[PDB]
Design a protein around this ligand. Sequence first.
Ligand SMILES: [Hg+2]
Ligand SMILES: [Zn+2]
Length: 255
Amino acid sequence: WGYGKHNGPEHWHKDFPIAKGERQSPVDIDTHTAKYDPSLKPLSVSYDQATSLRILNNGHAFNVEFDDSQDKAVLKGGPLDGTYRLIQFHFHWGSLDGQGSEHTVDKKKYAAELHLVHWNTKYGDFGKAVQQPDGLAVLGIFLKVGSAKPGLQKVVDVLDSIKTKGKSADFTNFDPRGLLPESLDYWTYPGSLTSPPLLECVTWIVLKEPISVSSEQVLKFRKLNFNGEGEPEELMVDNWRPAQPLKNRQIKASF
Ligand SMILES: [Hg+2]
Ligand SMILES: [Zn+2]
């Protein structure tokens, strides 16, 4: 699987039948049909103690991994029950500024989308979490092209070193707090991972307010390669999946 014409999203169903499931992600967020739920609590992001470890190019994207052996960086509150530990963050981006995000707002697409993945720590490890309907929580953040995002530059600068598939680099002392918008208002719905295995284990929490990044910052994302070293060069662009059918699910809003 990849994002090209021969192994693209439209083909994932063949190897991952769940591709056509009942709670697939991403979806279109219709702001007028979204339900304000007053019973929804404020999100609690505790990332002061986050321990970034490394950055790796896995052939589909670049992942920043965190030490999740203790409740170091956690997410709680909102629509969630119990604690969820940050394990990794990654982005989805387009070849042009008019596309890149997974989720859309009133059919509007952003230049990129940041996903902060967390797993429910009553399941003990990530692998068990993926076997539960409430095993995972992803914080989704939209990226729009405008002014540079200072807290994003350390990531941009190490990309050169993980240009092709399978490369990794030490990446410690990176604070994820530097990627958050001012406002924590969000939308939430039950979905799934947006790339195979597409497991339907996720509680989505898509933030209303996008963060802005510079054109030059998004340009370096686009210098990455899907391919391994010594292979014909295929630029890592458009690694996003098209919106899926809501199918009776209800999207709730905290505002
Ligand atoms: Hg699941
Ligand atoms: Zn993702």
